[PDB]
Amino acid sequence: SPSLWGDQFLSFSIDNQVAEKYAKEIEALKEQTRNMLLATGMKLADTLNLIDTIERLGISYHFEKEIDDILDQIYNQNSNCNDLCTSALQFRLLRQHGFNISPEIFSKFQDENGKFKESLASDVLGLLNLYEASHVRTHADDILEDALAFSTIHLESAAPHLKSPLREQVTHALEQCLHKGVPRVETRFFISSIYDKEQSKNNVLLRFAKLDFNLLQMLHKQELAQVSRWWKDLDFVTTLPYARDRVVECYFWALGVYFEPQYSQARVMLVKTISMISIVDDTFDAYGTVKELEAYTDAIQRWDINEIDRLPDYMKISYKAILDLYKDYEKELSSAGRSHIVCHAIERMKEVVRNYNVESTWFIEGYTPPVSEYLSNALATTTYYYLATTSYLGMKSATEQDFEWLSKNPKILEASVIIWRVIDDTATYEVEKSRGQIATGIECCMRDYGISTKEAMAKFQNMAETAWKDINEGLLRPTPVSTEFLTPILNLARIVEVTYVLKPHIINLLVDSIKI
Numbered sequence: 001s002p003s004l005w006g007d008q009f010l011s012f013s014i015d016n017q018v019a020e021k022y023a024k025e026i027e028a029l030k031e032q033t034r035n036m037l038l039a040t041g042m043k044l045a046d047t048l049n050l051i052d053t054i055e056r057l058g059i060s061y062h063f064e065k066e067i068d069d070i071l072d073q074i075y076n077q078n079s080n081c082n083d084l085c086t087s088a089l090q091f092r093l094l095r096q097h098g099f100n101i102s103p104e105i106f107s108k109f110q111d112e113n114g115k116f117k118e119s120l121a122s123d124v125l126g127l128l129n130l131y132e133a134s135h136v137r138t139h140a141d142d143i144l145e146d147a148l149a150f151s152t153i154h155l156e157s158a159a160p161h162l163k164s165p166l167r168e169q170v171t172h173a174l175e176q177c178l179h180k181g182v183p184r185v186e187t188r189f190f191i192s193s194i195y196d197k198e199q200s201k202n203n204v205l206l207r208f209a210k211l212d213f214n215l216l217q218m219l220h221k222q223e224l225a226q227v228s229r230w231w232k233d234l235d236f237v238t239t240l241p242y243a244r245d246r247v248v249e250c251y252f253w254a255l256g257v258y259f260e261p262q263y264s265q266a267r268v269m270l271v272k273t274i275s276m277i278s279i280v281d282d283t284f285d286a287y288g289t290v291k292e293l294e295a296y297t298d299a300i301q302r303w304d305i306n307e308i309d310r311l312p313d314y315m316k317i318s319y320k321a322i323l324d325l326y327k328d329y330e331k332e333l334s335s336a337g338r339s340h341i342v343c344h345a346i347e348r349m350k351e352v353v354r355n356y357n358v359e360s361t362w363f364i365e366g367y368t369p370p371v372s373e374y375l376s377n378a379l380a381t382t383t384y385y386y387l388a389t390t391s392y393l394g395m396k397s398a399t400e401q402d403f404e405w406l407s408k409n410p411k412i413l414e415a416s417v418i419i420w421r422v423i424d425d426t427a428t429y430e431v432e433k434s435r436g437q438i439a440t441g442i443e444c445c446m447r448d449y450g451i452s453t454k455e456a457m458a459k460f461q462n463m464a465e466t467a468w469k470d471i472n473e474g475l476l477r478p479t480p481v482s483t484e485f486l487t488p489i490l491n492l493a494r495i496v497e498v499t500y501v502l503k504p505h506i507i508n509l510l511v512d513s514i515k516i
């Protein structure tokens with residue numbers, strides 16, 4: 001099905017007059033907000049509420065040091081702000097930042113059984129912050145095992161009679177928790193549907209949030225235009241008609257990985273790769289034959305334009321674009337002297353292709369492997385080790401050691417990959433089946449364990465839940481690499497929720513600005 005979108009993004013000229021206006025006022029609001037953070041004698045609840053709000057407004061990327069030093073101090077002082085609301089929020093904010101605060105802070109809210117006091121069922125703000133906190137738990141937090149089911153049933157009961165915009169904030173949290181949501185997507189919802197309508201809102205912060213979001217959106221629009229032209233200069237809708245034309249969606253994905261302005265070059269490179277590999281996926285799935293695919297897989301392994309002649313004409317266009325894309329990457333990084341790290345992304349792409357081939361081999365043969373074998377292959381075909389490696393290309397700070405760490409398949413990356421795999425398979429267990437795909441994810445699980453379709457999807461969900469707990473542990477200090485390089489992996493898992501349907505998000509993020 002083609003693109004709802006058209007040439008709607010090919011053209012975009014940033015009215016520099018308006019951009020400079022926004023920037024100038026932002027710089028002022030930025031210092032005002034900074035001073036708010038550096039405020040002396042603030043109660044704990046207030047300081048947490050301030051940090052939470054600046055994060056939800058999507059402007060916390062300006063105060064990384066300030067917010068860190070404040071949470072560090074809160075971590076080390078271990079003061080007991082005894083209410084549920086302040087505790088849960090304190091827990092969440094610290095854990096999201098890597099501080100391993102003990103979960104025994106939730107003991108005072110539980111009876112002799114490790115279960116939450118049913119008497120807290122009437123504290124809505126407390127239930128909400130507990131709910132949000134329940135999604136950042138690791139394997140060592142069994143104390144919170146019932147926190148999610150507890151806060152959920154009561155939030156659902158109380159929701160209908162709450163005042164706005166709290167009613168809306170609660171209904172939305174029950175459909176999408178903050179921790180696992182895409183940053184920009186949650187920021188857009190918070191600013192306009194909640195905070196803007198909040199009676200006690202801080203005008204300086206709302207103004208700041210609206211201006212910043214709109215100004216960065218200008219940058220995203222420029223990037224998407226640049227990328228839309230690049231995509232038309234390839235004429236893949238014309239020279240190679242079988243693939244999906246989802247360059248806007250691919251941009252959304254890159255945008256979900258990181259939205260900050262400093263990751264502009266990074267976002268652009270990443271979109272090109274996501275769009276490129278989407279074609280290779282389309283080739284192996286709905287086009288190429290057993291012989292052609294084998295030639296394609298081999299050509300990719302060699303990685304030399306000379307092998308092009310062994311490939312039929314259509315695959316020649318794909319193959320050349322791919323090699324040229326990586327040549328551009330090498331060229332873009334030539335300046336800093338990081339052109340060289342590009343091979344890491346290439347090695348991951350070859351791996352994706354190998355497993356693509358293996359996947360079609362299993363389909364032809366009618367092979368239903370055991371879950372163990374299925375995953376040893378099906379994990380790379382999610383393309384996540386590949387996109388994750390690609391996301392480091394544009395990050396000027398990425399060193400060789402960061403790529404080295406990533407190539408060893410760290411548990412946090414492994415977890416992110418599993419989430420996409422398991423979610424995709426649960427989502428594609430019935431459709432894929434009628435297209436006669438035999439080595440489906442869940443069938444392998446069904447024939448391997450002796451469980452039904454229901455039990456197999458249920459077991460896959462636990463795999464995803466386990467994976468989230470692993471991602472959360474992966475964030476805890478000391479981190480194997482700087483947090484800057486863990487966030488892209490976390491975001492890749494977030495995008496999964498968000499996707500497993502994109503039109504609304506694209507409109508809210510790339511079409512409509514936030515009306516002031």
Ligand SMILES: CC(C)=CCC/C(C)=C/CC/C(C)=C/[C@H](O)P(=O)(O)O
Nearest residue numbers: 246249250278281356359381382383
């Ligand atoms: C335009 C969009 C949605 C881009 C990002 C979405 C994405 C990561 C899709 C992966 C497709 C896969 C894994 C194909 C494999 O060849 P296989 O069919 O073997 O799983």
